[PDB]
Amino acid sequence: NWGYGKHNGPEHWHKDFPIAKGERQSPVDIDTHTAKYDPSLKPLSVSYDQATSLRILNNGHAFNVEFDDSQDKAVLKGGPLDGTYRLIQFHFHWGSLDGQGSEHTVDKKKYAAELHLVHWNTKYGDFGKAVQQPDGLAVLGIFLKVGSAKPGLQKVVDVLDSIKTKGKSADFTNFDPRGLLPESLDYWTYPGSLTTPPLLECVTWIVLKEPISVSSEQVLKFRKLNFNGEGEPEELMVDNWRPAQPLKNRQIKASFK
């Protein structure tokens, strides 16, 4: 029964999910002066040329663009990762106002939104087994700032009216996630968790330094979605972000000098 409201939001999650107060929780503030360049990081490889998107779903908390992960078709490798991680879905977190919405922050700066491309480690066979492992998942996080429109986002925006309410889905084939990436792949990395319940501590986070720009009109259309189901009182889908959590005994590494 978790969500993002006053009575069921992030400050309540620990009661059903005690790992919310764990040693490896996400998101975090990225203190750029404390993060250290790591020359042992290999080059990051984002191989999304054969990505096969299938469907888009409003799950009552965000919307997921789902991919066919039955074959190695869209994969993340390199950087801090060992082996191959397969893309299963992406989603966003965003605010009610342009001054908030991201989960990670950079020297306490909040962006308008944050894109998460979720991948699972193929050594574990499927996503469900991967989320029982400390290196099960790799999430590529990309900040969104408001400015010029992002052409590669428009197909997402324009289908949101068809998935307004919780539980609705639509066909969403032939979507190219390359068009959501910034120019540079410079990143920060650290060990963390899912940022929604069950908050499992299974993620290698790779957070790109360069944000993408999206237009005010694009993000306003995200804010017309609903957390509620059809025929229920409208609750706008906004502020579906968890705030930064304690870094504890962790180090954030940078890929760039």
Residue 197 CB, nearest approach to Co ion (Å): 12
Our measurement of the distance from residue 208's CA atom to the centroid of its chain's CA atoms, rounded to an integer in Å, reads 12
Q: Is 166 in the site for Co ion (CB under 5 A)?
A: no
- Closest to Co ion by CB, 9 vs 38, is 9
Q: Scanning residues 181 to 200, which ones bind Co ion (CB under 5 A)?
A: 195
Q: Has 34 been labeled as part of a binding site?
A: no
The catalytically annotated residue of 7, 12, 14, 61 is 61
Cα–Cα distance measured from residue 37 to residue 27, given in angstroms and rounded to the nearest whole number? 20
| DSSP of 197-237 | TT--S-EEEEEESSPEEE-HHHHHHHTT-BSSPTTS---B-
Smallest distance, Å, CB 231 to Co ion?
Answer: 28
Residue 137 and residue 151: Cα distance in Å, rounded? Answer: 28
Secondary structure letter of residue 194 according to DSSP: -
Neighbours of 6 (CB within 10 A): 8
Tell whether residue 165 is among the known ligand binding residues.
Answer: no
- CA distances for 166 relative to 41, 94, 96, 203, angstroms: 40, 17, 18, 26
Cβ proximity to Co ion, 142 vs 249, nearer residue: 142
**10/149 Cα distance (integer angstroms):** 31
Shortest distance, position 226 Cβ to Co ion, whole Å: 19
Token duo for residue 150: 């992002």
Residue span binding Co ion (CB under 5 A) among the ranges 32-40, 110-118, 130-138, 245-253 = 110-118
Token representation of residue 235: 């609750």
Instruction: Write down how long the chain is.
Output: 257
Task: Tell me how many residues contact Co ion (CB under 5 A).
Answer: 2
Report in angstroms how near the CB of residue 91 gets to Co ion at its nearest.
6
61 is annotated as an active-site residue: yes
52 is in an annotated binding site: no
> Which of the ranges 18-26, 114-122, 162-170, 232-240 carries the binding residues for Co ion, by CB under 5 A?
114-122
The CB-nearest residue to Co ion is 116
Nearer to Co ion, 209 or 242 (CB): 242
Q: Which stretch binds Co ion (CB under 5 A): 112-120, 147-155, 159-167, 222-230?
A: 112-120
**Is residue 116 within the footprint of Co ion (CB under 5 A)?**
yes
| CA-based max dimension of the chain | 55
Q: Which is nearer to Co ion, 38 or 63 (CB)?
A: 63
**DSSP 3-state of 247:** coil
Task: Provide, rounded to whole angstroms, the least separation between the CB of residue 117 and Co ion.
Answer: 9
Place of tokens 């499927």: 126
Is 209 near Co ion (CB under 5 A)? no
Task: Reduce the DSSP state of residue 129 to 3 states and report it.
Answer: helix
Nearer to Co ion, 80 or 101 (CB): 101
As annotated, the binding site includes 91, 93, 116, 195-196
Q: Catalytic positions, please? A: 61
Residues engaged in binding Co ion (CB under 5 A): 116, 195
